Ligand binder design. Structure first.
Ligand code: A1BQG
Ligand code: ZN
Length: 139
């Protein structure tokens, strides 16, 4: 679990969005595993606007943060799960690191701010849904 709180927006993994997230829907994209909902309170976070390929993510299944090198956002095949059929997930960045289901929502940050959230994993890999291209989050 986990979310990004920026301005009057909450960014979560689409597959973990609550009834309240869907009742206050701003934008969602199944191909990216992202959903953004509106909030009444002003959020705690800054979004990175950069091309960093290194940063640090929070791994809830270890209660720890780990440094990672990650690929540029791209279209990557993701196996079928209970939440989606087998498909290509876009804007996804992979890195070598620990992740379990439950780790989705952990933030990846670089020195400029929030880069994205954990969205996929397994086999010693961790995948992050990129948010740096969503310029409207702080416009
Ligand atoms: N389609 C998606 O974005 C995900 C939906 C939930 C299930 N998916 C995983 O990759 C979970 C996972 C498996 C094993 C270790 N770590 C993990 N985070 C795919
Ligand atoms: Zn950066």
């Amino acid at each position: 679990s986990g979310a990004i709180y920026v301005g009057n927006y909450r960014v979560v993994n689409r597959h973990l969005a609550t009834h309240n997230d869907w009742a206050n829907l701003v934008w969602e994209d199944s191909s990216r595993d992202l959903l953004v909902s509106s909030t009444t309170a002003q959020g705690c976070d800054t979004i990175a606007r950069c091309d960093c390929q290194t940063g640090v993510y929070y791994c809830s299944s270890r209660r720890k943060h780990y440094p990672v090198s990650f690929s540029k956002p791209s279209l990557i095949f993701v196996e079928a799960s209970e939440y989606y059929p087998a498909r290509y997930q876009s804007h996804l960045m992979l890195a070598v690191g620990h992740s379990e289901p439950g780790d989705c929502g952990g933030i990846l940050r670089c020195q400029h701010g929030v880069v994205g959230i954990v969205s996929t994993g397994g086999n010693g890999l961790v995948g992050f849904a990129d948010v740096r291209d969503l310029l409207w989050l702080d416009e």
